[PDB]
Design a protein around this ligand. Structure first.
Ligand SMILES: Cc1ncc(COP(=O)(O)O)c(CN)c1O
Ligand SMILES: Cc1ncc(COP(=O)(O)O)c(CN)c1O
Lengths: 513, 512
């Protein structure tokens, strides 16, 4: 060590002890290259692929060429507050795709951004615009209910029923209700998410992300989420019912005036991933989808469908939600839309709910830039080409890779519990090894580092790049490009059988450095 | 009347301001649109990505480097592997900071995708520090309590009962714990300046003063207190108002007393060296020294936001170094993407930096190889030839400011001030809400004056200016360092024309 270090020291220390301390110098297709002791390029097969950003692989020639052309044409990258038709054009296409895949003829407005978290946060913000609109309306009614009950109570007709007063003379009861209601109005809203949810790591979005050491230090900053148990959905109704909050009004009935509770909108939005990355690639079950629908219908807030990972074809359709029958009101996309080379994202918000203020009170310096716009159109061209046969490829490559994984599970069920996911978004679940015979394995599994250690084995002994997913690296992710070959899938089967035979043997010398 | 899938409202509005144009190509300080007949009309760009284009649109050196990086098969997505370029970029910014401040401090770098993301990394790390302070204080309080309980039970001391307005032993102990836990879970506060603009995401928007942008989202996130930058002698009392204390038991031989102890409510202080949302006002020495006192006093970090002021714009790399602001965290963005890609960075002082952050924060796109490579190029360019790029910025800045000042001197009836430094300048417009012209008065009342004037400049002089400040009350001028004397002259002509029409209250001509 010794010498000054200006970034990544801790991160690199850790990567090294996991066996993952390598620098990749070049990438193409499903292959990334590092330099060995002697200085030649060793090819490594990439199953992580930007955590699912690279449906078309690293540095796809068609995307590279288009990008260089865009650069040579003098594309206007920074043209803020001018007419940028390409944003309308991208949205037209995603709209047409959504209609095709859902049957539904709904229209969405598009707001662009620079990352998944930014796009989800545009959704969070627009959700909260809708709640403020509901809130204003209810408080307007309450005012008129009060004025009415006061004129009945003063002029003569009615008498205040005093048994209602545990909830708080006229003016004093009125002002106490306004005091109560204003306190309630200013309380932060709640967001609903699923357990294992991963929606981004910014100040707002991190609260929507379950992972405990990532989120808990920041609890005090921003509105919280309630993390619904996705596997036991019959439980979700009661948990949301617990969260009801009411405000107060005065209610006239001829001659009796009563203080009464009225429902207050606490919940700003519900968020769901069609396939749940922080949970180990579990797809949302039909039962769960129908509970989310009920919740959205019931509370009158938007269902936000987060397709940062599941979208642009990964699941065997453009939208994973369409595949799995999830009918959201807002949608977000990112990752693969930058083509593997630039940074872009988008929030699609239904036009019958969309509030025009948002188009001019939200904005960003880099958002909607011409270059990533141009690259977005190219990606959508590619994924849609030839009668939508790119999706068919994804399906059949996905089937092939899942069958291999399922075949590996069947012979190694002692260390592998499940295969999860769909299309080319798959994972193996590892059985717990916190109770393991090998000292060195047990200690890593106890630290939540098992998956990373196994990944290091796969790197150094088989030249395959896998990365773990899930809360204690308890899952191994497999999300390669659509061009993944049978030979590469066979090489991965060989590698995995090797890995899980060593893990069966509890061979800690060999697994842990 | 046909289906529309984005930008309908935005485009409606741009059109009525006179700003409804499509640019098809850009190079240097010039953007091009197509006229009725289909030829490229050149427009001089004074907005330049709101200050992102210190080197202009699509600078050949940046374009070429980018295409090379693409041809080389650069690894863009290499998450959780060894990416030396991030350490390299940080080494350089470190060396630059030492050079320009004299200070030999070391900063850790965390990268991101926008200015708001970078500022929010800072927000998050500020709050990690406060949780550490909080844990420590509550640890002491525990031991103060155990001690005061053993004195009170084992003879020596008696509880002085006059202290009890603040809440028998166990009952007083548990009431203190109840009080303290309530206080521990309250959201922190952030301090900013009036007119502050720090980003528009859920967290960052609360740090942004602009009222219609922020107020709808109040309920979501911790608030800021917006300090009055022009009247700093007032800032001490406003922060004092915000003190909150916790309770402990304090032993003095024989008397045990309940007493207050200071609680850290403030997570960070944020400042822009030159304040974009305020119309390009630079932080005065007096204000800087008040921010220093505040940071020393509260023990939270001073976060210096150089998203706009950095990468040379002010005539040094760091605007804070120019203006004598000594922050603990720094953030950069905008010009570091070279005008073509999206990147940002948080520099956090290593003696304050908490190692957990390096592994509990992360982002998909952050630290990508491509914007990394382009970052090194930009830093190479801005540092080249003995740091003469900065000297250029100074001298171009002087020239453009003198023109603006000269325009002010003959048009002081409609122009109050010139603000800013280096190539980050603005004219302040006098209020026109009281204006003679109907059509002008109505736009000024809507907060749209600056946009209307901008439309005049576009259609009658082929110059692109955009307003700044809360009611478009300022006109921004922030072009590349390559801006020419001829272009500056053409802008002087255009401005004299504009402010002569505005003097004339010529609403027919100004408002479409
Ligand atoms: C499903 C999902 N949603 C949101 C995000 C956040 O996206 P980004 O990293 O671009 O901010 C991610 C990235 N992990 C994601 O995988
Ligand atoms: C000083 C400052 N800080 C933060 C931001 C936000 O940066 P971005 O738009 O890339 O999120 C801006 C851009 N208005 C800025 O000028």
């Amino acid at each position: 060590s010794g010498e000054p270090v200006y970034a990544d020291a801790v991160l690199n220390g850790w990567l090294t002890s996991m066996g993952l301390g390598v620098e990749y110098v070049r990438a193409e297709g499903n292959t990334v290259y590092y330099l060995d002791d002697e200085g030649r390029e060793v090819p490594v097969l990439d199953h992580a692929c930007g955590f699912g950003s690279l449906i078309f692989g690293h540095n796809h020639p068609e995307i590279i060429a288009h990008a260089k052309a865009a650069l040579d044409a003098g594309t206007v990258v920074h043209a803020q507050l001018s007419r940028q038709p390409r944003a309308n054009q991208i949205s037209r296409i995603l709209n047409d795709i959504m209609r095709r895949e859902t049957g539904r003829d709904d229209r969405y407005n598009a707001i662009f951004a620079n990352s998944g978290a930014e796009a989800n946060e545009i959704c969070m913000k627009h959700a909260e615009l809708e709640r403020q609109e509901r809130i204003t309306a209810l408080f307007a009614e309450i005012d008129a209910e009060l004025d009415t009950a006061r004129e009945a109570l003063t002029t003569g007709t009615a008498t205040l029923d005093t048994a209602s007063l545990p909830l708080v003379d006229v003016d004093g009861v009125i002002a106490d209700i306004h005091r109560h209601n204003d306190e309630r109005r200013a309380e932060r809203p709640l967001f609903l998410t699923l357990d294992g949810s991963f929606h981004g790591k910014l100040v707002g979005s991190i609260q929507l992300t379950q992972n405990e050491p990532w989120r808990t230090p920041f609890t005090a900053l921003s509105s919280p989420a309630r993390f619904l148990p996705a596997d036991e959905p019959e439980l979700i109704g009661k948990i949301v019912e617990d969260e009801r909050r009411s405000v107060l009004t005065l209610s006239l009935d001829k001659d009796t005036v009563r203080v009464v509770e009225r429902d207050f909108p606490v919940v700003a939005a519900i968020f769901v991933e069609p396939v749940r990355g922080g949970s180990g690639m579990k797809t949302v079950t039909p039962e769960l989808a129908e509970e989310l629908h009920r919740l959205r219908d019931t509370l009158g807030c938007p269902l936000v469908v987060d397709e940062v990972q599941t979208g642009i074809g990964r699941t065997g359709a453009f939208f994973g939600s369409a595949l799995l029958g999830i009918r959201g009101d807002y949608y977000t996309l990112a990752k693969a839309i930058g083509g593997g080379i630039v940074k872009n994202s988008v929030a699609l918000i239904r036009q019958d709910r969309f509030l025009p203020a948002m188009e001019v009170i939200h904005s960003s310096t880099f958002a909607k830039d011409g270059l990533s716009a141009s690259i977005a159109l190219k990606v959508l061209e590619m994924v849609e080409a030839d009668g939508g046969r790119v999706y068919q490829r994804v399906r059949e490559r996905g089937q092939r890779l899942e069958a291999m994984l399922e075949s590996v599970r069947a012979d190694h069920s002692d260390v592998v519990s499940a295969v999860w996911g769909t299309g080319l978004m798959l994972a193996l679940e590892l059985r717990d090894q916190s109770n393991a015979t090998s000292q060195a394995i047990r200690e890593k599994a106890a630290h939540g580092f098992l998956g990373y250690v196994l990944a290091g084995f796969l790197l150094r002994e088989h030249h395959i790049r896998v990365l773990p997913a899930g809360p204690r690296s308890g899952f191994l992710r497999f999300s390669p490009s659509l061009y993944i070959t049978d030979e590469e899938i066979d090489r991965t089967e060989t590698a995995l059988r090797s890995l899980f035979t060593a893990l069966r043997d509890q061979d800690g010398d060999r697994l842990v450095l």
